[PDB]
């Protein structure tokens, strides 16, 4: 599949720095992308689609783009409310079987 | 393509039976008769077969026309006549009540109904020059 | 009303623009025109020609 | 806008066939594609797949398809899926997602390939314990 080498795999932070997640691809990938989130215990939201811009009607701190493959999602301020996972998903085989992914695994300062 | 020389077979159409035999006859005479690129060898070849598919029909058709007026006595000729008599029984008219004031498809329409009859008819009146 | 049949393929945006076609007749056959220039629907074309 | 509610846990040993319903309403269900996804606690994600619903037509997932079946009913504008031949690994939290779509009834239909909403959780025990 699209070869989600996510960078960091799991990242243990803290709030407010810059997010770069790497989940890249092998294959010739557009503009398809997708990233989204799932707190402890809770349920996923979306964050970033488009592939090319912020996502809509979302509180758009965030800027989930980049070049290509290498598409970054960018919350420069992390908070004490994204101690939650982050996700990258593709949708664009055609014939159309669509794929998925498995994201990354987001934790909190863990000592 | 020799083909096209039965357009001219119906170039003469409403000139009437006596002058349409008249300029038949006399067009017996007149009647008488790059980079071609890597794509460019194989579907031009399958032009040229479709062509080539025309002359020879063309004279295929025309091989089977003179054959079938073997049957009928005559062949290579263009105003034939043979060794039977009209019958009476095929829409009587005066001999100049069509020779000077009617067209062919008149004909036609007239005895569509028995040319397969009179088409016998001349394939067996033969036979009996055989015999004899 | 009866049963149906989804066909999933690939569809590439590609180039599409007519051209003249034109029908022949095969050889022993003819076509004829209508060259008159008030062809009601129906009816004897007083001119015709062949091609 | 359509809402989306999810079902519980079920035990049952690979095999089984089980029925569970993200029953989505509240306002026009037309203009909005749907799919599923499910994921085991701490593993990857199950991705199930969209159902065109204005044609009523769905797809799955390569190495699912031959014990799924999604279904969404235009008539009372629901939707159903039924589960069978499960495996016993498979115990997930399961989700329904949507996207805003466009006016089919007028024919136009983006179909794009994101998952705008999200469900609540739906588990399946795939065993006898
Ligand atoms: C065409 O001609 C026929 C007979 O001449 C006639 O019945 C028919 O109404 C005509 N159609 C027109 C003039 O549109």
Redesign the pocket.
């Known amino acids: 599949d699209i070869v989600m080498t996510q960078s960091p795999a799991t990242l243990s932070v803290s709030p407010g720095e810059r997010a770069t997640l790497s989940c890249r691809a092998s294959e010739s990938v557009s503009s398809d992308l997708a990233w989204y989130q799932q707190k402890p215990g809770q349920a996923p939201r979306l964050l970033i689609y488009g592939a090319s811009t912020r996502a809509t009607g979302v509180p758009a701190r965030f800027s989930g783009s980049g070049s290509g493959a290498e598409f970054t999602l960018t919350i420069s301020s992390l908070q004490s409310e994204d101690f939650a996972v982050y996700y990258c998903q593709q949708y664009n085989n055609w014939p159309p079987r669509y794929t998925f992914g498995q994201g990354t695994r987001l934790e909190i300062k863990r000592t | 393509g020799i083909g096209a020389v039965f357009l001219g077979f119906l170039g003469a159409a409403g000139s009437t039976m006596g002058a349409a035999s008249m300029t038949l006859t006399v067009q017996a005479r007149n009647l008488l008769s790059a980079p071609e690129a890597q794509q460019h060898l194989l579907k031009l070849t399958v032009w040229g077969i479709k062509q080539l598919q025309a002359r020879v029909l063309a004279v295929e058709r025309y091989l089977r026309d003179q054959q079938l007026l073997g049957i009928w006595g005559c062949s290579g000729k263009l105003i034939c006549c043979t060794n039977v008599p009209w019958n009476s029984s095929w829409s009587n008219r005066n001999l100049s009540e069509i020779w000077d004031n009617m067209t062919w498809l008149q004909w036609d329409k007239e005895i569509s109904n028995y040319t397969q009859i009179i088409y016998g008819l001349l394939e067996e009146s033969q036979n009996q020059q055989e015999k004899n | 009303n009866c049963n149906t049949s989804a066909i999933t393929q690939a569809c590439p945006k590609v180039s599409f623009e007519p051209i003249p076609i034109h029908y022949c007749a095969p050889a022993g056959f003819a076509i004829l025109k209508c060259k008159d220039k008030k062809f009601?629907?129906?009816?004897p074309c007083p001119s015709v020609s062949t091609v | 806008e359509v809402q989306l509610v999810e079902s519980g846990a079920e035990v049952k040993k690979p095999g089984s066939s089980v029925k569970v319903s993200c029953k989505a309403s509240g306002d026009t269900f037309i203009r909005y594609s749907f799919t599923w996804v499910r994921q085991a606690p701490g593993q990857g994600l199950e991705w199930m797949g969209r159902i065109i619903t204005i044609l009523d037509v769905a797809h799955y997932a390569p190495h699912l398809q031959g014990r799924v079946t999604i279904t969404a009913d235009k008539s009372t504008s629901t939707v159903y899926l039924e589960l069978r031949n499960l495996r016993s690994d498979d115990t997930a939290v399961y989700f329904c997602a949507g996207v805003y779509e466009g006016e089919a009834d007028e024919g136009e239909y983006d179909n794009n390939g994101f998952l705008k909403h999200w469900g609540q959780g739906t588990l399946v025990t795939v065993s006898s314990a």
């Open positions: 009601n629907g129906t009816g």
